[PDB]
From Swiss-Prot:
Belongs to the YSP2 family. Disulfide bonds: none annotated. The gene is LAM4. This is Membrane-anchored lipid-binding protein LAM4. May be involved in sterol transfer between intracellular membranes. The VASt domains bind sterols. Residues 15-185 form the VASt domain. The lineage of its organism: Eukaryota, Fungi, Dikarya, Ascomycota, Saccharomycotina. Changing residue 167 to R: Abolishes the ability to bind sterol. It comes from the Eukaryota. It is found in: Endoplasmic reticulum membrane.
Amino acid sequence: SSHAPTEPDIQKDKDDSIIRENENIPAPLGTVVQLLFGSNTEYMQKVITRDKNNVNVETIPKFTPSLVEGGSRHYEYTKKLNNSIGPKQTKCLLTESIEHMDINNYVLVTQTTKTPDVPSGSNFAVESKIFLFWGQHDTTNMTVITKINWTSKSFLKGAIEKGSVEGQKVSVDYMLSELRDIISR
């Protein structure tokens, strides 16, 4: 009765970094997909607002045309940065795309973040692949892989890549913590 654990089909890319891997969420795959990406979007909104640096978090739309391979959505919030010296905050422009959906195997949603107000923010977007697949005993594993798409290379490239990895890890930890709390409550 327990679904078998599965393997995500993670295509390699030399500028990829691992954010988190094989993080367990104690609910079935279809449930976790629905909690993050389904029609009740308050859960993903709360993932974002759990970080008190995240403000102006608009209502998140559902995936259109449908929650299906090829569906996508956009939303925006603001992230507080420095206390006083610029920049004090940045807009965060998020686009999510359903790249692969197979509840018998794995789901891949790509999450791309643009931050126009950071230094060199006009030079890059952050692309994170969120893999969801089966763990043991009808639970879900999550693996997140990140790379920076440089649309113009920056003299701050190394610092930005390090801080982005650091920030993607914090973002994914809130996602995992909220998921783990929704299930337990």
